[PDB]
Design a protein around this ligand. Structure first.
Ligand code: CLA
Ligand code: CLA
Ligand code: CLA
Ligand code: CLA
Ligand code: CLA
Ligand code: CLA
Ligand code: CLA
Ligand SMILES: CC1=C(/C=C/C(C)=C/C=C/C(C)=C/C=C/C=C(C)/C=C/C=C(C)/C=C/C2=C(C)C[C@@H](O)CC2(C)C)C(C)(C)C[C@H](O)C1
Ligand SMILES: CC1=C(/C=C/C(C)=C/C=C/C(C)=C\C=C/C=C(C)/C=C/C=C(C)/C=C/C2=C(C)C[C@@H](O)CC2(C)C)C(C)(C)C[C@H](O)C1
Ligand SMILES: CC1=C(/C=C/C(C)=C/C=C/C(C)=C/C=C/C=C(C)/C=C/C=C(C)/C=C/C2=C(C)CCCC2(C)C)C(C)(C)CCC1
Ligand SMILES: CC1=C(/C=C/C(C)=C/C=C/C(C)=C/C=C/C=C(C)/C=C/C=C(C)/C=C/C2=C(C)CCCC2(C)C)C(C)(C)CCC1
Lengths: 74, 28, 172, 121, 32, 73
């Protein structure tokens, strides 16, 4: 149950940021991030911000958190 | 071509496997 | 229970008496290794990184006359002084100091702390106050120097740029 | 003069490992100096860089390399063999001081052999 | 290769330093 | 390595009765380990390998959009 609860609450917090992220990014994106796709949950946009190195950067600190905080916490 | 960064990213993930391997080894 | 990470339990083998204690050990390396070794390793890695951070800061508006005409970038410098045969003299001298300061007991199996807390290598010629919060001041400067040094060399590898030039007005 | 016992044990008695009066460190130091000095020879003259400019440097560094392995070997032996600790050589503290003597001696002995061959090349 | 220096550090490490450390560690482990 | 470590922690050590559940292990290993692996692998051949064989790049970047057959499902 402790595992499943950790997973549910983790999914809850990731999903909530992601749903608000989509809505916020739809309303307006930053200029220097030249977002060609207006569809936020498209492969086209995902692929762009992997190549920009934006999702590469947040992957690093998410992976950092999960290994140094999330895994000890679990 | 595989960049210096890609080779070093591989090494940190191999380090993580090292950590988790030692954890398993120590318990077994 | 851990002051630094209250959601995690306190690392048992750590203690508040140890200098720079926040109870910060999420990986629990203090369970895997003897604290006295880790403590000694921390302060040493610090003291070495401290000198390394100064080395880069001084050899930038200077480079000692008699060694003039050498690149101040990390990897080119390393390659130059190894070819010169200066780094091999430094290696043996550091090797000498390591054996002298630890008095023979250099191994993780051998190194002991009879009448010396970790870090106390018996080097205080000026005789400044030691047994106080001065150990925490060494640790904080050492910890900052270790991250500092890491920030210098990675900046030196990224865009081949000087430590002091980076903090002017530059983005990639 | 018996030869088998008298000259044998008489000589052996005066060797640094056996000689009365010496601290473990000075026994080590003397043993080191003797070994470091001669050990450079094979590496200098028969090593892979013997016909290069690095002939002597390569010879010295190799000798220091070997001496480090020997000293680590010494330290491991002492740690395993001596759970008890005392001032005598056959003890944890004494064996570590002997090892310290040997390493200093052998690096210095190697260095001294390198200095003489450069002095009288 | 890109990081053509790495074999100069890792082959000695895996080939000399780590085997000596492992032999040393196992020696103490099986003799205590 | 995490799974290995987890399953020798007291709460995650499976019971002897679990290990001797023959019928369950066979169902799962047949339908899941062999069956679904072969089904999923078919997916790879149809979506990635066969396209690659015909000079059509299908990868993680585009596989959602690029149908492996014109007629679809
Ligand atoms: C480089 C070597 C190094 C070593 C050997 C140590 C060792 C120690 N640290 Mg220190 N620390 C360091 C660097 C180091 N630290 C740096 C650079 C910082 C600044 C962030 C800190 C900040 C810090 C705090 C706030 C605290 C410690 C504490 C400790 C002690 C327990 C934690 C532990 O897990 O030990 C062993 C740790 C290691 C071997 C580090 C391994 C690092 C991995 C392999 C790579 C990480 C890269 C990044 C992503 C131990 C003596 C705790 C203590 O009780 O001090 C008395 C404590 O509260 N450290
Ligand atoms: C410990 C203190 C410390 C300080 C004060 C800095 C300060 C800085 N870092 Mg550094 N950095 C550090 C540690 C530190 N770093 C460490 C431990 C690493 C991991 C090795 C890095 C890896 C890093 C990278 C990859 C980059 C910086 C960059 C920078 C600059 C930010 C410019 C910017 O993006 O806006 C700034 C001068 C950026 C820079 O120099 O501009 C191009 C940059 O690209 N840092
Ligand atoms: C097995 C190979 C070997 C090799 C290649 C050498 C080579 C050397 N020895 Mg060594 N030596 C050896 C074994 C070896 N030794 C052994 C087993 C001992 C007994 C412990 C010694 C004891 C010894 C002493 C006491 C001295 C040397 C010295 C020398 C050097 C100069 C000799 C010379 O002028 O001839 C040139 C080469 C040839 C003719 C070939 C030379 C580098 C001398 C030295 O280092 O001078 C400063 C010196 O004083 N050796
Ligand atoms: C077993 C016999 C044998 C011998 C004599 C040699 C000899 C040599 N090898 Mg080879 N080698 C061998 C087997 C051998 N090898 C094997 C089985 C392999 C595995 C494939 C190799 C692989 C190999 C490589 C990869 C290399 C060599 C190299 C060498 C040279 C330098 C080695 C060196 O510096 O030694 C160091 C020697 C010592 C530290 C001491 C030797 C023993 C001393 C002299 C004994 C003295 C005892 C004394 C008389 C007692 C007196 C006591 C009291 C009365 C005072 C030398 C010509 C190197 C070379 O460059 O070739 C030209 C090199 O790079 N060898
Ligand atoms: C991955 C495993 C590995 C690696 C990287 C090496 C590397 C080397 N071996 Mg080989 N060797 C190995 C396994 C390995 N060995 C095994 C398993 C055997 C048994 C079959 C051998 C048998 C062998 C022989 C017989 C010889 C070599 C030699 C060499 C050197 C030849 C290059 C040269 O010209 O240097 C020339 C020498 C130098 C540039 C001086 C450097 C010597 C060391 C690195 C001194 C470092 C001192 C330092 C302060 C303290 C660290 C010591 C130690 C803990 C590393 C090179 C260092 C030759 C050699 O010269 O060795 C001394 C040689 O004669 N090897
Ligand atoms: C869907 C459910 C499922 C799945 C996927 C698995 C999977 C696995 N379980 Mg099982 N297990 C399950 C349910 C499942 N289990 C249930 C319900 C129970 C309790 C009733 C168990 C009880 C159990 C125990 C006690 C053990 C396992 C073990 C295993 C592992 C076996 C080793 C292996 O990796 O084989 C891989 C197998 C295949 C890929 C199948 C095909 C292999 C054949 C030979 C086909 C030939 C190859 C083919 C042509 C491909 C070529 C590839 C390429 C090179 C070209 C595997 C990961 C073992 C283990 O290792 O745990 C860590 C183990 O000890 N399981
Ligand atoms: C037995 C089943 C199987 C096997 C062995 C492979 C093997 C491979 N696939 Mg294929 N693939 C499969 C089924 C399989 N696939 C299925 C069912 C589909 C959907 C139709 C695909 C669609 C697909 C695409 C689009 C691509 C691949 C690619 C690859 C190659 C690299 C994969 C990689 O980096 O992951 C490393 C291994 C893992 C991460 C293993 C753990 C599996 C995790 C836990 C499950 C998650 C699956 C996946 C990684 C992420 C899902 C993405 C999501 C949007 C659905 C490798 C040859 C890539 C390639 O480069 O092609 C040449 C590539 O771009 N595959
Ligand atoms: C990342 C990077 C940055 C780097 C800055 C980073 C954070 C700073 C890290 C450096 C540290 C703090 C140096 C540590 C100081 C060390 C000094 C050299 C100590 C002197 C000697 C003492 C006092 C003790 C010895 C003695 C003791 C035993 C006591 C007595 O016996 C007397 C003596 C004998 C002196 C920027 C900001 C530049 C920007 C750039 O873009 C990228
Ligand atoms: C606390 C701990 C954590 C760890 C925290 C993390 C940030 C610690 C990482 C430490 C790093 C950054 C040390 C790096 C610096 C240390 C060394 C010793 C620097 C010596 C360099 C010199 C000696 C080179 C001479 C050079 C000179 C000067 C000039 C050049 O030209 C040539 C060269 C040759 C390069 C966690 C998160 C893992 C969890 C765990 O549970 C608890
Ligand atoms: C971070 C960084 C760095 C570093 C890094 C490195 C150096 C790395 C390393 C790495 C490594 C070094 C890794 C390792 C690994 C390991 C592993 C991964 C292992 C494995 C194992 C296993 C898997 C198993 C085993 C076993 C056995 C055999 C016995 C007992 C049991 C068991 C099963 C456990 C540098 C400097 C670049 C800089 C930048 C940053
Ligand atoms: C042939 C013969 C023989 C043989 C021989 C032999 C065996 C010899 C050997 C010899 C030897 C083997 C020698 C050696 C020597 C050595 C030396 C002489 C050294 C010294 C050193 C020094 C001088 C210094 C040091 C140092 C330094 C430099 C630095 C710091 C540290 C120290 C202090 C340590 C016999 C007799 C049997 C018989 C007859 C014939």
């Amino acid at each position: 149950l402790e595992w499943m609860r950790e997973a549910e609450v983790k999914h809850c917090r990731v999903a909530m940021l992601a749903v608000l992220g989509v809505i916020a990014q739809e309303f307006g994106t930053l200029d220097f991030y030249h977002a060609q796709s207006k569809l936020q949950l498209s492969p086209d946009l995902h692929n762009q911000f992997v190549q920009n190195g934006a999702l590469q950067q947040v992957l690093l600190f998410v992976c950092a958190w999960e290994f140094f905080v999330g895994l000890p916490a679990l | 071509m595989i960049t210096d960064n890609q080779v070093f990213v591989a090494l940190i993930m191999a380090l993580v496997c090292g950590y988790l391997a030692v954890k398993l080894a120590a318990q077994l | 229970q851990s002051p630094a990470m209250p959601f995690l339990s306190k690392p048992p083998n750590l203690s508040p008496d140890m200098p720079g204690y926040r109870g910060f050990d999420p990986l629990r390396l203090s369970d895997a290794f003897d604290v006295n070794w880790l403590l000694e390793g921390e302060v040493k890695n610090g003291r070495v990184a401290m000198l390394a951070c100064l080395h880069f800061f001084v050899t930038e508006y200077y480079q000692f006359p008699f060694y003039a005409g050498a690149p101040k970038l990390a990897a080119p410098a390393h390659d130059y002084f190894v070819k010169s045969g200066a780094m091999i003299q430094i290696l043996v001298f550091i090797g000498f100091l390591e054996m002298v300061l630890h008095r023979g007991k250099v191994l993780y199996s051998d190194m002991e702390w009879k009448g010396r807390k970790p870090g106390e290598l018996g080097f205080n010629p000026l005789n400044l106050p030691n047994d106080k919060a001065m150990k925490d001041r060494e640790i904080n400067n050492g910890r900052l120097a270790m991250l500092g040094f890491a920030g210098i060399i990675h900046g030196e590898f990224l865009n081949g740029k000087m430590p002091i030039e980076q903090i002017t007005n530059f983005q990639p | 003069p018996i030869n088998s016992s008298s000259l044998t044990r008489g000589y052996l008695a005066q060797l640094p490992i056996y000689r009365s009066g010496l601290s473990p460190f000075l026994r080590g130091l003397e043993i080191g100096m003797a070994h470091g000095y001669f050990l450079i020879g094979p590496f200098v003259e028969l090593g892979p860089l013997r016909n290069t400019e690095m002939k002597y440097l390569a010879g010295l560094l190799s000798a220091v390399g070997l001496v480090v392995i020997l000293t680590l070997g010494m330290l491991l032996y002492g740690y395993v063999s001596f759970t008890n600790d005392s001032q005598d050589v056959e003890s944890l503290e004494g064996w570590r001081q002997l090892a310290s003597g040997f390493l200093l001696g052998a690096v210095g002995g190697a260095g001294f052999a390198y200095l003489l061959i450069y002095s009288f090349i | 290769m890109s990081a053509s220096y790495l074999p100069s550090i890792l082959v000695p490490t895996v080939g000399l330093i780590l085997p000596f450390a492992t032999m040393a560690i196992l020696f103490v482990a099986i003799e205590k | 390595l995490l799974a290995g470590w987890l399953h020798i922690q007291p709460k995650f050590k499976p019971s002897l009765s679990w290990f001797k559940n023959n019928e369950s292990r066979l169902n799962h290993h047949l339908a899941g380990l062999f069956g679904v692996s072969s089904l999923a692998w078919t997916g790879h051949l149809v979506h990635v390998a066969i396209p690659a064989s015909r000079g059509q790049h299908v990868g993680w970047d585009n596989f959602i959009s690029v149908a492996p057959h014109p007629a679809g499902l």
